[PDB]
């Protein structure tokens, strides 16, 4: 899982 | 971006 | 599952 | 964008 | 199953 | 724009 | 564009 | 499957 | 561009 | 998989 | 740019 | 996964 942000 | 697998 | 915002 | 599979 | 928007 | 398979 | 395949 | 935009 | 395959 | 932006 | 493979 | 921004 990767969650990525600004 | 939200990328998920197993 | 990918989801991509702006 | 979202682009699912199993 | 994709979803595209603008 | 939707694609929808199995 | 669109080209869809199996 | 190819999905091509501007 | 999205390119997809198996 | 590819998806490619601007 | 994303680029998944398995 | 290769995810490339700016």
């Not at 899982?1 to 600004?6: N, W, Y």
């Given at each position: 899982?990767?969650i990525?942000?600004?």
């Amino acid at each position: 899982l990767i969650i990525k942000g600004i």
